[PDB]
Design an enzyme around this catalytic site. Structure first.
Site, PDB file in Angstrom:
ATOM      1  N   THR A 237       0.794  -1.220   0.000  1.00 18.12           N
ATOM      2  CA  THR A 237       0.000   0.000   0.000  1.00 18.12           C
ATOM      3  C   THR A 237       0.836   1.284   0.000  1.00 18.12           C
ATOM      4  OG1 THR A 237      -1.962  -1.045   0.962  1.00 18.12           O
ATOM      5  CG2 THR A 237      -1.730   1.329   1.281  1.00 18.12           C
TER       6      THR A 237
ATOM      7  N   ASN B 153      -0.258  -5.921  10.821  1.00 18.86           N
ATOM      8  CA  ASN B 153      -0.085  -4.592  10.265  1.00 18.86           C
ATOM      9  C   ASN B 153      -1.068  -3.604  10.882  1.00 18.86           C
ATOM     10  OD1 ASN B 153       0.089  -2.313   8.684  1.00 18.86           O
ATOM     11  ND2 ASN B 153      -0.411  -3.327   6.741  1.00 18.86           N
TER      12      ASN B 153
ATOM     13  N   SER C  36      -3.521  -2.431   7.983  1.00 16.66           N
ATOM     14  CA  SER C  36      -3.849  -3.480   7.030  1.00 16.66           C
ATOM     15  C   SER C  36      -5.026  -3.127   6.118  1.00 16.66           C
ATOM     16  CB  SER C  36      -4.167  -4.783   7.775  1.00 16.66           C
ATOM     17  OG  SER C  36      -4.359  -5.866   6.875  1.00 16.66           O
TER      18      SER C  36
ATOM     19  N   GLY D  29      -2.611  -8.620   1.290  1.00 16.43           N
ATOM     20  CA  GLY D  29      -1.539  -9.590   1.200  1.00 16.43           C
ATOM     21  C   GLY D  29      -1.709 -10.909   1.926  1.00 16.43           C
TER      22      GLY D  29
ATOM     23  N   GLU E  66      -1.783 -13.777   4.359  1.00 22.00           N
ATOM     24  CA  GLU E  66      -1.834 -13.729   5.815  1.00 22.00           C
ATOM     25  C   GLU E  66      -2.230 -15.035   6.497  1.00 22.00           C
ATOM     26  OE1 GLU E  66      -6.412 -11.954   6.533  1.00 22.00           O
ATOM     27  OE2 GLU E  66      -4.686 -10.597   6.635  1.00 22.00           O
TER      28      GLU E  66
HETATM   29 MG   LIG Z   1      -2.135  -2.807   2.289  1.00 21.63          MG
END
Ligand SMILES: [Mg+2]
Ligand SMILES: Oc1ccc(/C=C/c2cc(O)cc(O)c2)cc1
Length: 735
Positions: free
Chosen positions: A186, A233, A236, A457, A459
């Site tokens: 991102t 994250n 996220s 992504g 995970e």
């Molecule tokens: Mg992202």
């Protein structure tokens, strides 16, 4: 003058390798040789440097750090590159291409905050987890129009190359940024947008910066409603997106379009320990005025079931109140009226109140609502009849043949239906936000476009459900797309051109895993899920029994665990993941009582009414005797995306996470090497070294820099640095 040639510029300070000293020079001119070895045979990802002290025809003997001498076959030896290569910008230049050598180069650069490194034709970006001043307008200006080899590795550089290719070849391009959760997809996507907006923006006045400004402002909006803190994250992305940056025939940005994918709706009503709900919820409660909080019946996050179950309401270093200000300014710039913005927050507020409704058992098994405080507050902000909402929640009407039968849901079912309403409200709001944004962005027929892909992504959590399968499946397909373009198509070209190329098997192929998931004949997991999804007597248990029946001990990428009866494992390119089957049928069917929809269709709110009346937002493909399932819908959207990507010239950026603690200056070899391996980074470099990258048709090779169409004796004197195909001439590496 020129920043790139001035060793005092920020460009040199933050993007180039630091000048080594006389002591390093001494070590650099040394005649000694070294190898990377494993001090501990078990830990094959932990290396140390050893000096080669002797050798035989087929082996090396080196000294370990402690002092002991070890021997190894030259075929299994991981030689260390001459240190003059330490920090090299393109690892295809390395003399020795092996795992520890590649990791070491990335480490040297990383240690001095050089996060970008070329790995042949694609870029590698290792997350720094700290701010590095390499994205200023000054930095942008430097890469403008520069050839990749003329400037240091950078996300801007690959962005410019894709832009030049789009104009030179008049062909659409795409920037595919891979990476597991938290790797940096991102952040890098935002940079590609920033760069394109600038380099190809309208260089005129404020007005000529309106579009480009609205393009950049679309991100803060979406992230506020689509991003959340997970254990991997703090920011996220819980939805995927393909961003189309559109250009006119002249090469100027004429617009942009956003396609959103798979929003994790379930996060609105549930969050694992230490995670958060979507940012927007915290932004509103912390940044809303006393007036608004009174009108919306707002209060602290701890007063809401949807925000007080994780044990986490704030993110270190983030001011939700300040972020709320940024979100509102972005909506203003994009074009959301003040009336629309208030409706949006009314919906967000409404969702929170809906979450506080507490259902209880009545005289019989049917549920009742003793305290109606939350129900009334929700109804108030949504603009619907609380009496109708209450009935639609606990006593929805359904058909039993053709007869109209009023149901009376127990506590559990009432709670689920309420959650269904919430998820439908959030999901539709998100689609609406994206829709509004696009209408404003799309103001002309594009001539070309550069597509930027930024998906959720790969995970793995302690509990992996249907959402994770969809996410990981997507990541698996993106990886195969890299494999397809880097290895399969590349070699097929050599085969067709017959340039005397012996096929090489790189060992990278996720087709089996992909088929296990989305195959139709024989049926894969998604197919069997859909089948069970329309079977009137199916249960989460019959479903997993069905899955085990078809794949247990039969498909090499599937595993029926011996330690559980509700989970199944899928061996993904990035590792095996165990999936819990609980609720898969309901998640795939994605039900919503019609009476709930009827209640909200009568909403007095302009935004709410559109979420339930607009067919493009509220209707569902009833393809067949049943509504299309989430699986069939997504499989479809993904196939469409992939088909689109295939009509573009792809550029890959492999984001790499340094560790699993979101910490800077802490590059962990085991974590990094796993990613380098499953990403196929070294294989991608090898294909580039042993292969023939560039190639042009003879007839059309007449010095783009006589005319007979034979490339005839156009020998511009090396017989080894090229080949001649049935219709083209290839080149080794450098032109
Ligand atoms: Mg992202
Ligand atoms: O600088 C840093 C900033 C944030 C973090 C994240 C920590 C964290 C917090 C949680 O509740 C769960 C989790 O999985 C990780 C780590 C370092």
């Amino acid at each position: 003058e020129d920043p790139i040639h001035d060793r005092t510029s920020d460009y040199h300070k933050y993007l180039k390798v630091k000048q080594g000293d006389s002591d390093l020079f001494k070590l650099t001119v040394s005649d000694k040789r070294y190898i990377w070895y494993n001090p501990d045979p078990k830990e094959r990802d932990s290396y140390e440097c050893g000096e080669i002290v002797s050798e035989t025809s087929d082996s090396f003997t080196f000294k370990t750090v402690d002092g002991q001498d070890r021997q190894v076959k030259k075929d299994d030896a991981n030689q260390r590159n001459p240190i003059k290569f330490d920090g090299v910008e393109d690892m295809s230049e390395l003399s020795y291409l092996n795992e520890p050598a590649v990791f070491h180069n990335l480490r040297v650069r990383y240690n001095q905050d050089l996060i970008y490194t070329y790995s042949g034709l694609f870029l590698v970006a290792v997350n720094p987890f700290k701010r590095i001043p390499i994205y200023t307008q000054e930095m942008v200006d430097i890469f403008k129009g520069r050839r990749r080899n003329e400037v240091a590795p950078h996300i801007f550089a690959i962005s410019d190359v894709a832009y030049r290719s789009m104009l030179d070849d008049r062909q659409n391009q795409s920037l595919l940024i891979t990476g597991e959760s938290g790797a940096g997809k991102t952040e890098n996507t935002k940079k590609v947008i920033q760069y394109l907006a600038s380099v190809a923006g309208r260089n005129q006045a404020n007005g000529s910066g309106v579009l480009e400004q609205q393009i950049l402002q679309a991100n803060p909006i979406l992230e506020a409603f689509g991003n959340a803190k997970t254990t991997r994250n703090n920011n996220s992305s819980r939805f995927g997106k393909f961003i189309e940056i559109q250009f006119n025939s002249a090469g100027f940005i004429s617009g942009a379009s956003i396609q959103s994918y798979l929003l994790e709706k379930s996060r609105v009503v549930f969050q694992s320990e230490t995670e958060r709900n979507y940012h927007i919820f915290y932004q509103l409660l912390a940044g809303a005025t006393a007036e608004e909080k009174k009108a919306l019946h707002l209060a602290g996050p701890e007063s809401f079931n949807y925000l007080n179950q994780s044990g986490c309401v704030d993110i270190k270093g983030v001011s939700d109140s300040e972020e709320f200000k940024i979100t509102r300014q972005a909506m203003d710039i994009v074009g959301f009226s003040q009336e629309e913005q208030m409706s949006i927050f009314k919906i967000i507020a409404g969702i929170l109140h809906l979450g506080n409704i507490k259902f209880e058992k009545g005289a019989g098994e049917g549920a009742v609502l003793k305290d109606k405080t939350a129900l009334n507050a929700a109804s108030t902000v949504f603009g619907v009849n609380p009496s109708v909402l209450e009935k639609a929640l606990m006593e929805p009407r359904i058909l039993a043949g053709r007869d109209l039968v009023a149901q009376h849901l127990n506590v559990e079912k009432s709670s689920s239906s309420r959650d269904a309403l919430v998820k439908a409200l959030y999901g539709r709001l998100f689609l609406w936000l994206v829709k509004k944004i696009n209408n404003v962005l799309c103001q002309e027929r594009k001539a070309y476009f550069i597509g930027v892909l930024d998906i959720s992504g790969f995970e793995i959590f302690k509990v992996n459900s249907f959402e994770q399968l969809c996410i990981n499946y997507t990541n698996e397909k993106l990886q195969q797309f890299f494999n397809h373009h880097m290895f399969k198509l590349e070699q097929e070209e050599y085969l067709k051109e017959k340039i005397n190329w012996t096929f090489i098997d790189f060992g990278l192929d996720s087709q089996a895993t992909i088929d296990l998931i989305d195959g139709r004949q024989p049926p894969g997991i998604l197919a069997l899920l859909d089948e069970q999804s329309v079977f009137p007597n199916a249960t989460d248990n019959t479903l997993i029994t069905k899955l085990h029946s078809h794949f247990s001990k039969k498909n090499a990428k599937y595993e029926e665990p011996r330690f559980s009866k509700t989970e199944f494992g899928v061996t993904h390119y990035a590792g095996q993941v165990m999936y819990e089957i609980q609720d898969w049928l309901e998640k795939n069917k994605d039900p919503l009582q019609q009476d709930l929809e009827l209640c909200f269709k009568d909403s007095s709110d302009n935004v709410v009414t559109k979420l339930f009346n607009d067919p493009n937002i509220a209707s569902r493909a009833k393809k067949g005797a049943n509504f299309i399932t989430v699986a069939a819908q997504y499989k479809e959207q993904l196939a469409s995306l992939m088909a689109t990507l295939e009509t573009t010239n792809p550029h890959f950026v492999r984001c790499i996470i340094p560790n699993n603690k979101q910490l800077p200056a802490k590059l962990e070899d085991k974590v990094v090497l796993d990613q380098l391996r499953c990403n196929g980074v070294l294989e991608g470099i090898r294909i580039t070294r042993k292969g023939f990258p560039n190639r042009i048709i003879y007839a059309d090779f007449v010095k783009r820099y006589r005319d007979a169409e034979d490339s005839q004796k156009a020998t511009d004197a090396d017989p080894e640095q090229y080949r001649f195909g049935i219709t083209k001439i290839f080149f080794r590496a450098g032109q």
